[PDB]
Ligand binder design. Sequence first.
Ligand SMILES: Cc1cc(=O)c(O)c(C(=O)O)o1
Ligand SMILES: [Mn+2]
Ligand SMILES: [Mn+2]
Length: 178
Amino acid sequence: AMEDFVRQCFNPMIVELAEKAMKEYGEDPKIETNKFAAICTHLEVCFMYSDFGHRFEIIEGRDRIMAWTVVNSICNTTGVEKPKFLPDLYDYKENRFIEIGVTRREVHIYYLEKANKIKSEKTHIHIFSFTGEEMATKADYTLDEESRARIKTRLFTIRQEMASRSLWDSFRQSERGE
Ligand SMILES: Cc1cc(=O)c(O)c(C(=O)O)o1
Ligand SMILES: [Mn+2]
Ligand SMILES: [Mn+2]
């Protein structure tokens, strides 16, 4: 059911990218179905965030060679410090990397968990939930209200589609993919 939901509610490029990533790390999308749903969800949010500028450079969703090539290239041309972990986007307006979090827990909880993982990075963090809450470093939300609204609508819609199919309860009590 969850597997069907993913193939039927996300765009094939996203499903394919999610699927590939899982398979290369020897994870089965048919088994880790909540993880699959989470990967697709996070991928879509990153793409949606990208498609609101050429304000943003998309890092997530590429292979690691391409991802680090983009990062090194941004670092050389801007002077900005290299992160230890691949972030999700670069913002050429604010001239900072962004880490995007999508969580089924409280936003402040996930925010802390992410901020702790990459502390000593100057990376901007922007967390979204499936309840329309967000949290961003310095309450700087980067995007305008309409763009933010569109991401939250999409997240809430995924949530409610899951609930239509009695999948939301499994999904929410899982953290796999965060
Ligand atoms: C588990 C997790 C959560 C993310 O938000 C993220 O961007 C990544 C990633 O880029 O690997 O991994
Ligand atoms: Mn990422
Ligand atoms: Mn992320």
